[PDB]
PDB file of C-alpha atoms in Angstrom:
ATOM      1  CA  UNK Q   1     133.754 157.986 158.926  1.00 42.90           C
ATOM      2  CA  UNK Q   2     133.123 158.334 155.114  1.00 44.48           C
ATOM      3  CA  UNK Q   3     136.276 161.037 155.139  1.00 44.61           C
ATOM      4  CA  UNK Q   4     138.965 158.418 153.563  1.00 43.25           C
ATOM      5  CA  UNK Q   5     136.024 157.416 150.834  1.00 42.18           C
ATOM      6  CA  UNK Q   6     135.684 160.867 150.254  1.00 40.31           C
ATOM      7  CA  UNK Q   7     139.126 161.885 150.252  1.00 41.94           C
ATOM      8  CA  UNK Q   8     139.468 159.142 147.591  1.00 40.14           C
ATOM      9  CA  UNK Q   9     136.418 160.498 145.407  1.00 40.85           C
ATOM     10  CA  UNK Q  10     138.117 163.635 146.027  1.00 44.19           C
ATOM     11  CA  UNK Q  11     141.132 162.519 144.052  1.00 43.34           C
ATOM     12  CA  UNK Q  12     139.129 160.733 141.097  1.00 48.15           C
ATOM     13  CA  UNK Q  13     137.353 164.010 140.857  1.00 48.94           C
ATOM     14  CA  UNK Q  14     141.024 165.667 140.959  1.00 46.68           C
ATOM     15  CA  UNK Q  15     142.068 163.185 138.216  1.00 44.65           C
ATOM     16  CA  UNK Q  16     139.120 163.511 135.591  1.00 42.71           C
ATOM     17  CA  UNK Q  17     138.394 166.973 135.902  1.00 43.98           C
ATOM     18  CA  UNK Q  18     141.238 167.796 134.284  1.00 44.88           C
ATOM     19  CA  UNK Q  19     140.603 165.978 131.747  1.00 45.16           C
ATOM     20  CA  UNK Q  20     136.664 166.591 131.312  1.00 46.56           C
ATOM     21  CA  UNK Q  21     137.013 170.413 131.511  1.00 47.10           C
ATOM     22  CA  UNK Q  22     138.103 170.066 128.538  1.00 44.64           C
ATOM     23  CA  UNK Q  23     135.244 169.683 126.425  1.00 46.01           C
ATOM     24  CA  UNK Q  24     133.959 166.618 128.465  1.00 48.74           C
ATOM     25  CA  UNK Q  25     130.134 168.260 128.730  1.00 46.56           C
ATOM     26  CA  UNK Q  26     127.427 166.556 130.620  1.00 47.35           C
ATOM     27  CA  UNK Q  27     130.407 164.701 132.499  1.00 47.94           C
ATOM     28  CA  UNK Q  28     131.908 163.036 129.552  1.00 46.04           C
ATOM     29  CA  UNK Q  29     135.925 161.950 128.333  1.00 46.62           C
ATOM     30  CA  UNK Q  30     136.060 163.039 124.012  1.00 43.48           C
ATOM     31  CA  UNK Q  31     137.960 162.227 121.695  1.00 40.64           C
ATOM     32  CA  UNK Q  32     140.503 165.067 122.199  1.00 40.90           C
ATOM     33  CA  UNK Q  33     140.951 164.338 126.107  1.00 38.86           C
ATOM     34  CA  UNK Q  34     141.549 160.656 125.510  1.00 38.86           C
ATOM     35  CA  UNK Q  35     144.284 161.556 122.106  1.00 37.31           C
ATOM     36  CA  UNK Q  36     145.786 163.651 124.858  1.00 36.80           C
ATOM     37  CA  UNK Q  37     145.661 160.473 127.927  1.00 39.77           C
ATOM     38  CA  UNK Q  38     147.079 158.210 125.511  1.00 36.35           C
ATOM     39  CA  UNK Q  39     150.023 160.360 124.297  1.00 35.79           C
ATOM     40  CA  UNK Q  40     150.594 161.298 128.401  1.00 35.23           C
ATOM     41  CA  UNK Q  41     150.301 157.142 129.147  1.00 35.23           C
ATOM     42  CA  UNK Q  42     152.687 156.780 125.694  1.00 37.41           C
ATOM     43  CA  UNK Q  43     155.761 157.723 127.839  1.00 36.96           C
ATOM     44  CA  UNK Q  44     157.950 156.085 130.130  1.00 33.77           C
ATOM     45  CA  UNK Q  45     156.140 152.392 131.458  1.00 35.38           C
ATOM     46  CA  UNK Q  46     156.537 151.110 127.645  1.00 34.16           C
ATOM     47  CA  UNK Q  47     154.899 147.476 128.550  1.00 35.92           C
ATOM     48  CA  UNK Q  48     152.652 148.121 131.476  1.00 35.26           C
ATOM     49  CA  UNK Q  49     151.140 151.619 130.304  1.00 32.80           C
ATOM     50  CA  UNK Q  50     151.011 150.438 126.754  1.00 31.68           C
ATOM     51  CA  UNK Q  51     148.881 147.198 127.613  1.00 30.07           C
ATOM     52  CA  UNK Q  52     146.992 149.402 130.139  1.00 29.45           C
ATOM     53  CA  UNK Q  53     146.893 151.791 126.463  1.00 31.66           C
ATOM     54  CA  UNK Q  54     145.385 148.612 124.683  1.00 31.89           C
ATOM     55  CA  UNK Q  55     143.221 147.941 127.454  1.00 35.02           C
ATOM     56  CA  UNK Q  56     142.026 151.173 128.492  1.00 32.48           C
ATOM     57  CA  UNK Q  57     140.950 152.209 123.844  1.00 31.73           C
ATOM     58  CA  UNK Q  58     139.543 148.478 123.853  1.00 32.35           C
ATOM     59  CA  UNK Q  59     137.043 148.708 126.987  1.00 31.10           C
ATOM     60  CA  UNK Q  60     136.383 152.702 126.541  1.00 30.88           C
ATOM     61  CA  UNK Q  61     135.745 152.367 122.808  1.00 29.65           C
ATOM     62  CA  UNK Q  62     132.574 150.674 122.862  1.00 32.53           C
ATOM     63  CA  UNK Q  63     132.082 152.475 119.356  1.00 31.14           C
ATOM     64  CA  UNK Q  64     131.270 155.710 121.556  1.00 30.26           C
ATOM     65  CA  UNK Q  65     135.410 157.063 121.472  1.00 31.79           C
ATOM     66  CA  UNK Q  66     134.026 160.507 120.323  1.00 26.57           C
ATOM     67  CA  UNK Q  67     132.850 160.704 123.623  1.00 24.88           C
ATOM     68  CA  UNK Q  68     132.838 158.042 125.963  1.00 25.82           C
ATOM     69  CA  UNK Q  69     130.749 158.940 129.616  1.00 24.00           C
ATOM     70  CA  UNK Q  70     132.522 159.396 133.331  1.00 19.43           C
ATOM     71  CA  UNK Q  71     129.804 156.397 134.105  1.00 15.66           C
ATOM     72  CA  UNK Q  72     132.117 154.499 130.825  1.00 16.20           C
ATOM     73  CA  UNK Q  73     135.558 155.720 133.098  1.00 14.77           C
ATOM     74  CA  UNK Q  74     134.224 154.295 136.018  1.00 19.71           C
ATOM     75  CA  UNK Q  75     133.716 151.026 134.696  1.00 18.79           C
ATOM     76  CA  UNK Q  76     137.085 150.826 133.351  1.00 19.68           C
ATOM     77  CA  UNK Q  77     138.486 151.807 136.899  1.00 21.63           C
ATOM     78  CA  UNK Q  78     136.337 148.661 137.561  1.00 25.18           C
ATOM     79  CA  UNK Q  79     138.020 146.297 134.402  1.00 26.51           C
ATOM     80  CA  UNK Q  80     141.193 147.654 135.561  1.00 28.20           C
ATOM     81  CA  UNK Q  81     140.576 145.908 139.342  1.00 27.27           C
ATOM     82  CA  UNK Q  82     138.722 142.834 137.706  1.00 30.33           C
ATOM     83  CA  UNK Q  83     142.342 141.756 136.450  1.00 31.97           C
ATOM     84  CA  UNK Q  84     141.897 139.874 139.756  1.00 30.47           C
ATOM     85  CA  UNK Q  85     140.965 136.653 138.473  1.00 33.87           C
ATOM     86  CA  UNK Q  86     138.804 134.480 140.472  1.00 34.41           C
ATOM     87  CA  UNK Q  87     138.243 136.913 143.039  1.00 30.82           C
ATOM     88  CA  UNK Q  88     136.859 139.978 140.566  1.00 31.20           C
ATOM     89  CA  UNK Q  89     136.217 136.742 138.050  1.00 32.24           C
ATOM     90  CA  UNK Q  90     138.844 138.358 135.714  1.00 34.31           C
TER      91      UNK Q  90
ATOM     92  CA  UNK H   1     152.169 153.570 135.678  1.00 35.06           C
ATOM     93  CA  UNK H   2     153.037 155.044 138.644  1.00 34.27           C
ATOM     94  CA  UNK H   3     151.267 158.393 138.614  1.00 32.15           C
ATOM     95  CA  UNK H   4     148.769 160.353 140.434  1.00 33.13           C
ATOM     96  CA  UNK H   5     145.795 158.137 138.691  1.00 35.26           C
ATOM     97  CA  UNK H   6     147.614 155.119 139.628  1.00 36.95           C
ATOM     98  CA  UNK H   7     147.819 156.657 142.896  1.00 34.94           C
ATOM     99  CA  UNK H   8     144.169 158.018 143.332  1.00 34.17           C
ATOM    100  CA  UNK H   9     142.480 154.652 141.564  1.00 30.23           C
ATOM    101  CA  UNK H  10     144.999 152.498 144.151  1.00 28.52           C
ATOM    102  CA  UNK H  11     144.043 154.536 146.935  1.00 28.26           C
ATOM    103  CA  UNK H  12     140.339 154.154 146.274  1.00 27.23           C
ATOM    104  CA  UNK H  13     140.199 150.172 145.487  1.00 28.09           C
ATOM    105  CA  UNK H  14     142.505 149.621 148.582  1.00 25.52           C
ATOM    106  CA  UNK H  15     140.392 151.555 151.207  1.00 28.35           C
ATOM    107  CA  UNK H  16     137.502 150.271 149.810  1.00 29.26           C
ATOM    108  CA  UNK H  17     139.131 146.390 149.782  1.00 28.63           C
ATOM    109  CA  UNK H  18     139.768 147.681 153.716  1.00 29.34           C
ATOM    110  CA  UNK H  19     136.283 149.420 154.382  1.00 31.42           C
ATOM    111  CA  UNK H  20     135.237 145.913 152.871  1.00 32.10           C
ATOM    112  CA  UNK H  21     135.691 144.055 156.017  1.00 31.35           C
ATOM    113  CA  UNK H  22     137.491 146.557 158.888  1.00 29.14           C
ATOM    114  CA  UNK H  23     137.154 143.607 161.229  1.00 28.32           C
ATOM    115  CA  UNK H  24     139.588 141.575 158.036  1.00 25.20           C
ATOM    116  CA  UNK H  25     139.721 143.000 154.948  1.00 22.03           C
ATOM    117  CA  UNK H  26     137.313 141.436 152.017  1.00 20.23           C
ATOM    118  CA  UNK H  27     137.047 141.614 148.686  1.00 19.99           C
ATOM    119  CA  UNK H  28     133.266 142.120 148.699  1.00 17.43           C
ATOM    120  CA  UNK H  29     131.770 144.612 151.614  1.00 19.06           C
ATOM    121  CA  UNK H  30     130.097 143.014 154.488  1.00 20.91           C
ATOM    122  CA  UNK H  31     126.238 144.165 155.859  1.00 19.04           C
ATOM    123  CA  UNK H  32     128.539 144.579 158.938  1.00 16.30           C
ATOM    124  CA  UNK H  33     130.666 147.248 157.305  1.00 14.74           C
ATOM    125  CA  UNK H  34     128.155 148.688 156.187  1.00 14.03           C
ATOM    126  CA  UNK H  35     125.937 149.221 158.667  1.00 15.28           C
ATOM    127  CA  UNK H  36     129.281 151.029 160.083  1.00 15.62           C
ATOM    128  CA  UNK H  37     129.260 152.890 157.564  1.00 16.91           C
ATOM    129  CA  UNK H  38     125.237 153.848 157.613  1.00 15.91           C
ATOM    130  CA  UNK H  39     125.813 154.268 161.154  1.00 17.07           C
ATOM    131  CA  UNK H  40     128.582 156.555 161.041  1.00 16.40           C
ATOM    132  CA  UNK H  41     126.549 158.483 158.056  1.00 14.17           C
ATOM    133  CA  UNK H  42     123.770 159.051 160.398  1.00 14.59           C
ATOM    134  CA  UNK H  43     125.237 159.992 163.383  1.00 16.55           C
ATOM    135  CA  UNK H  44     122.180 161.714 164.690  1.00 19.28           C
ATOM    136  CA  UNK H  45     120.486 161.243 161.311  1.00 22.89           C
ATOM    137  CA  UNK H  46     121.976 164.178 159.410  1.00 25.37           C
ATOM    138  CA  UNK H  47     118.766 164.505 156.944  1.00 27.37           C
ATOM    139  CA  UNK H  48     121.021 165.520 153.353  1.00 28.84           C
ATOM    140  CA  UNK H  49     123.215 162.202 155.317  1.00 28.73           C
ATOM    141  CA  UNK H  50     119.492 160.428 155.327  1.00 28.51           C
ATOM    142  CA  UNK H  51     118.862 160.837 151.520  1.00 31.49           C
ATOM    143  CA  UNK H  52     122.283 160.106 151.121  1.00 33.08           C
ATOM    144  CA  UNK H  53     121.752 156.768 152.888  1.00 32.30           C
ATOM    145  CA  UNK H  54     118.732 156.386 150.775  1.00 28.87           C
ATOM    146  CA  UNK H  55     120.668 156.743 147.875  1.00 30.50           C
ATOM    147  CA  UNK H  56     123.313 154.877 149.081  1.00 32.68           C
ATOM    148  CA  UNK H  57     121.365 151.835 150.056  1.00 34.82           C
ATOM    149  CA  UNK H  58     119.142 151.967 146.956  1.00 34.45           C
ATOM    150  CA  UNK H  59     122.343 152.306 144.510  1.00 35.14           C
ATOM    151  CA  UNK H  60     124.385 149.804 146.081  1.00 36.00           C
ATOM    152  CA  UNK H  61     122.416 147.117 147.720  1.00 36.87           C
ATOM    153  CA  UNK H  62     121.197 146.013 144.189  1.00 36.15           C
ATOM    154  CA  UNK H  63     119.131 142.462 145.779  1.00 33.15           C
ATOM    155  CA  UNK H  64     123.043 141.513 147.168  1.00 33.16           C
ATOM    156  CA  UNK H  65     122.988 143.338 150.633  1.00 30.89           C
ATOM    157  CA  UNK H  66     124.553 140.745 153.162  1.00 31.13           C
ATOM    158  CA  UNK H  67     127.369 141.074 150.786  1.00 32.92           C
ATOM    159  CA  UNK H  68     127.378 143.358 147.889  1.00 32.70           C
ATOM    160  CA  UNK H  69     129.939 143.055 145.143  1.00 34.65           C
ATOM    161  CA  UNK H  70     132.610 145.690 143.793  1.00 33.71           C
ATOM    162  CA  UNK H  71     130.769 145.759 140.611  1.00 32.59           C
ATOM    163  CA  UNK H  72     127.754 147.293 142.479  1.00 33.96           C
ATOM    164  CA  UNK H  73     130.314 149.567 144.547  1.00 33.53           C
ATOM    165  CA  UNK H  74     132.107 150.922 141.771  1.00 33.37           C
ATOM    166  CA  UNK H  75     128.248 151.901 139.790  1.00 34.20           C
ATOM    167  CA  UNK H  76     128.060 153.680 142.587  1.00 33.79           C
ATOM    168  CA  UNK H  77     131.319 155.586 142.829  1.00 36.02           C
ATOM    169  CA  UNK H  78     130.074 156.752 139.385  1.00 38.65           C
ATOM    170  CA  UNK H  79     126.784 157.604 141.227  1.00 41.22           C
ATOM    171  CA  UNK H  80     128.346 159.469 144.121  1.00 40.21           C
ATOM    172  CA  UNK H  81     130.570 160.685 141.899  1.00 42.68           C
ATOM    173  CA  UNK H  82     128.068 162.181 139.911  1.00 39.95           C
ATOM    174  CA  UNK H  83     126.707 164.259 142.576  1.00 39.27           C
ATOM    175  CA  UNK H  84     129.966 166.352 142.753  1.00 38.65           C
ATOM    176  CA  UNK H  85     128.874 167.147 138.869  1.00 34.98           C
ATOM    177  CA  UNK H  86     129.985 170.901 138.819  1.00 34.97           C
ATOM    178  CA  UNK H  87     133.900 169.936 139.905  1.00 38.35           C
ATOM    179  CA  UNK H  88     133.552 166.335 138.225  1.00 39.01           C
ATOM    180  CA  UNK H  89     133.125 168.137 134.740  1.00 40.15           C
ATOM    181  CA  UNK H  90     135.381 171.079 135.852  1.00 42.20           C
TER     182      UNK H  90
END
């Protein structure tokens, strides 16, 4: 059944939410809720978080940072799997 | 990092690398799988399920159908996604 999908969705929704209520209108990530991600990523995972910081302002900040849409979000989920070269290209 | 994103987005490309191909996991998700999943979705044809297999289908199957790609998948987690709008915004 779709349940496991769901349950998954479930989470993401869990995730961003928190996040999005605040401020993130018409189902958006701004400015203030991605200063905030980046100082909660800034922590302990100094190499891996901080190139997944680079990553994540790089691919989100398609000049729209201010406020960047859950469809933007999504698609980084998406650049975040494509690191599987070859198979997700890269 | 480990973390409950890392968690949720792990969760969701992994079942969905499984859902991919049940009968041996894939990368890319088989017509097999999902006509499972269609199948499953239906059940007796569960009408809101119907328009959701409309959607579905329509969303997903973008030309690519005997196999669709992750890129087309993940479009439509923000799609699906979408429709949970009042607790995706939060």
């Amino acid at each position: 059944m779709a349940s496991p999908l769901d349950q998954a969705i479930g989470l993401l929704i869990g995730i961003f939410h928190k996040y999005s209520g605040k401020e993130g209108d018409k189902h958006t990530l701004s400015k203030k809720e991605l200063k905030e991600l980046i100082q909660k990523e800034l922590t302990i995972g100094s190499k891996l978080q901080d190139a997944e910081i680079v990553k994540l302002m790089d691919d989100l900040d398609r000049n729209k940072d201010q406020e960047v849409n859950f469809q933007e979000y999504i698609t980084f989920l998406g650049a975040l799997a494509m690191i599987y070269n070859e198979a997700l290209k890269g």
